[PDB]
Each structure stands twice: as structure tokens, then as C-alpha cells.
Design a protein around this ligand. Structure first.
Ligand SMILES: CC1=C(Oc2cccnc2)C(=O)C=C1
Length: 186
């Protein structure tokens, strides 16, 4: 099936707990995979205009590890629940991808999660202004704009709204798209 095929490709890139104990300032992100109308999509958030770190930007659900978290995957699931109301029975965490190093003292660990078909996002307005889906295949032929820095523009055909996706978030999307969609019969 489409979903079994996805998890099997994703598992070949799992680095597991290899880098998880290093003494960094630690953040996790959830890369939420949704199946809709026969195809895979990623779920994104637009950050509230109120936040100190990066108001108004497109990002994956996530945030800073705290003393309650049993492990880095727990940080990502705690944070997704708080931002968009995703409960634990509604997500299967399939792997841990390569972590992202920033600012000399920070390590961001990405987890890929398969989302239940009956999940419906409840955006928390203190943290997220909007939630939207993008088909995974878009990231193989994106509409690119240069600000030199590469920016993706995605227009939702449901309503004509344009979102800008850039930086680490855009890098991770392309990575997931490659892993899952490369080399497939049609
Ligand atoms: C994650 C998920 C879907 O997408 C969305 C999009 C926006 C808000 N909530 C859910 C869906 O249709 C089935 C599970």
C-alpha cells in the first residue's frame, strides 16, 4: 500500500538515538504526513504574530525540550498537542531523520509521523495563526523565488491563498519528498 511503502522507505534513513545525548540546547519538530484524496501531504503551521521567535513564519509543529519529556520524540508530540490538538493515539512516529545544527550550541531533531485519517486541527491562536496542507509531490517541482536565498511559494487551489516556505522547514520538506517519492513506478 501507499502508507506501508512510505514507512518502509523512511525507516532506511532513521538514525535513532545516536545523536540524542550530546550536550546541546535541544528542540524537536514533527513532520506530519497526511493521506488525502489518494496522495501524501505535509501539514504546516503559520506561527502567531505574538511570538518572540519568528512571528508569522511557516514551520512544522515543535519546540524546546523540557524536564518532563522522556525522550526527543516526546518533545515533538507534546508540542504538536499544544499547538494543533494532535493526540497521541492520532500519530505513529516512524523515524528520526538527520538533526539540524544551528548557532554553535543548538541541535534540532526531526521526527516523521503518520497522522490518523480522522484528525482535524484545532489551531491554538496564542501559538499558531493558521494550519494548512501541501502535497508532498509539490516539493519535487516547487515554484521558487529568490530574496541570494531560495523561497518556495505554494498557492492552495481551494482558496487562492499563497504561503511562503523557506529555511530549515523548506530543506526538511524536500528531504522527505525525495525519500518517499524517488524511483517509483506510476
Ligand atoms: C491531518 C489530517 C488532515 O488535514 C488537516 C488539515 C487542516 C486541519 N486539520 C487537518 C485530514 O484531512 C485528515 C488528517
Amino acid at each position: 500500500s501507499m502508507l506501508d511503502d512510505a514507512k518502509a522507505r523512511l525507516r532506511k534513513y532513521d538514525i535513532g538515538g545516536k545523536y540524542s545525548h550530546l550536550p546541546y540546547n535541544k528542540y524537536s519538530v514533527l513532520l506530519p504526513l497526511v493521506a488525502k484524496e489518494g496522495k501524501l501531504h505535509l501539514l504546516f503551521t503559520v506561527r502567531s504574530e505574538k511570538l518572540r521567535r519568528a512571528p508569522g513564519e511557516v514551520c512544522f509543529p515543535g519546540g524546546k525540550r523540557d524536564p518532563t519529556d522522556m525522550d526527543d520524540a516526546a518533545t515533538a508530540l507534546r508540542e504538536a498537542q499544544e499547538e494543533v490538538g494532535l493526540r497521541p493515539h492520532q500519530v505513529e512516529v516512524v523515524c528520526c531523520l538527520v538533526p539540524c545544527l544551528i548557532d554553535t550550541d543548538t541541535l534540532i531533531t526531526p521526527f516523521v509521523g503518520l497522522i490518523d485519517h480522522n484528525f482535524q486541527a484545532q489551531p491554538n491562536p496564542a501559538e499558531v495563526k493558521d494550519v494548512f496542507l501541501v502535497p508532498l509531490a509539490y516539493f519535487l517541482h516547487p515554484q521558487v523565488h529568490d530574496q541570494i536565498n531560495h523561497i518556495f511559494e505554494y498557492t492552495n487551489p481551494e482558496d487562492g491563498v499563497t504561503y511562503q516556505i523557506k529555511g530549515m522547514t523548506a530543506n526538511l520538506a524536500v528531504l522527505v519528498a525525495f525519500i518517499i517519492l524517488e524511483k517509483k513506478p506510476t
